[PDB]
Write an enzyme that holds these catalytic residues in place. Structure first.
Site, PDB file in Angstrom:
ATOM      1  N   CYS A   1       0.795  -1.222   0.000  1.00 55.73           N
ATOM      2  CA  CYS A   1       0.000   0.000   0.000  1.00 55.73           C
ATOM      3  C   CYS A   1       0.833   1.281   0.000  1.00 55.73           C
ATOM      4  O   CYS A   1       0.369   2.320  -0.470  1.00 55.73           O
ATOM      5  CB  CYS A   1      -0.957  -0.001   1.190  1.00 55.73           C
ATOM      6  SG  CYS A   1      -0.235  -0.700   2.685  1.00 55.73           S
TER       7      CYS A   1
ATOM      8  N   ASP B   1       4.599  -3.317  14.741  1.00 55.45           N
ATOM      9  CA  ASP B   1       3.908  -4.159  13.777  1.00 55.45           C
ATOM     10  C   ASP B   1       4.580  -5.513  13.635  1.00 55.45           C
ATOM     11  O   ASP B   1       5.115  -5.847  12.579  1.00 55.45           O
ATOM     12  CB  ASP B   1       3.825  -3.467  12.417  1.00 55.45           C
ATOM     13  CG  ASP B   1       2.780  -4.091  11.516  1.00 55.45           C
ATOM     14  OD1 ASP B   1       1.873  -4.775  12.043  1.00 55.45           O
ATOM     15  OD2 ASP B   1       2.856  -3.898  10.284  1.00 55.45           O
TER      16      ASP B   1
END
EC number: 2.7.10.2
Lengths: 256, 4
Positions: A17, A126
């Site tokens: 993305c 993350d």
């Protein structure tokens, strides 16, 4: 920073993305991986400074940053991990063949790279199998420093309390991806259903063919109270000693 | 996220 001209992007390895990832060469003598930030996703000067912190960290289990191109599109030259991501690795051919010792081995290496981040007063944010890169001989390395709600700890997803102890929660989840061979956490549950269930005390049960001793470590990473989750130094050691101290009577099964 |  380096002259963009010395870089060559041969193959595309994947697209995300906020950019892309390419295998390539540097100075014609060095195989690298080049990450590209697709413009308009991140302010340059901003990403510029977060990146300086990627330089400081240097460990054997952290994908090493080699060089950077400051001009948009931004190039991040790092070290090439032939086997790609761990999730891809697990979901692919090898998943069939990997057994508990290999998995527990890969987990320990990640716990190792995270124990270093832990010492450095840093936080990943993350942590999940998609951000672990695999190289030769099952060498795993932590990459891409920070939505994956199912990998995130309650206090972090709701109140933005991101700590090294929220990475410990993410690690416990990572452990289920390993014992399941790439399967998605909380199978059958959508994020909101996950968020609500975990708040009420729900935790994932023991994956098939997974030993209770290993599931217990997951649940320790899944304690409601952050400061009560173990450190990565503890997890590293526990995993390294696993089949001697914890599961010496371990016998290979159909999948694990 | 830059590559999965």
């Amino acid at each position: 920073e380096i002259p963009r001209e010395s870089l060559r992007l041969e193959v595309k390895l994947g697209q995300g993305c906020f950019g892309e990832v390419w295998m390539g060469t540097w100075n014609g003598t060095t195989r690298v991986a080049i990450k590209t930030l697709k413009p308009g996703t991140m302010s340059p000067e901003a990403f510029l400074q977060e990146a300086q912190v990627m330089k400081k960290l240097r460990h054997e289990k952290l994908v090493q940053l080699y060089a950077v191109v400051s001009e948009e599109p931004i190039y991040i030259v790092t070290e090439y991990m032939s086997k790609g991501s761990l999730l891809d690795f697990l979901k692919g051919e090898m998943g069939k063949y990997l057994r508990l010792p290999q998995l527990v081995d890969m987990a320990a290496q990640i716990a190792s790279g995270m124990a270093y981040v832990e010492r450095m007063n840093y936080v990943h944010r993350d942590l999940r199998a998609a951000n672990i890169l695999v190289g030769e001989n099952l060498v795993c390395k932590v990459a891409d420093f920070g939505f994956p709600i199912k990998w995130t700890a309650p206090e972090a997803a709701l109140y933005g309390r991101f700590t090294i102890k929220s990475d410990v929660w993410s690690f416990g989840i990572l452990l289920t991806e390993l014992t399941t061979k790439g399967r998605v956490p909380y199978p059958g549950m959508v994020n909101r259903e996950v968020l609500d269930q975990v708040e009420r005390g729900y935790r994932m049960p023991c994956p098939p063919e997974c030993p209770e001793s290993l599931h217990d470590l997951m649940c320790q990473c899944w304690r409601k109270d952050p400061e009560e989750r173990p450190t990565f130094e503890y997890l590293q050691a526990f995993l390294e000693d696993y089949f001697t101290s914890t599961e010496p009577q371990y016998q290979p099964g159909e999948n694990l | 996220x830059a590559x999965a």
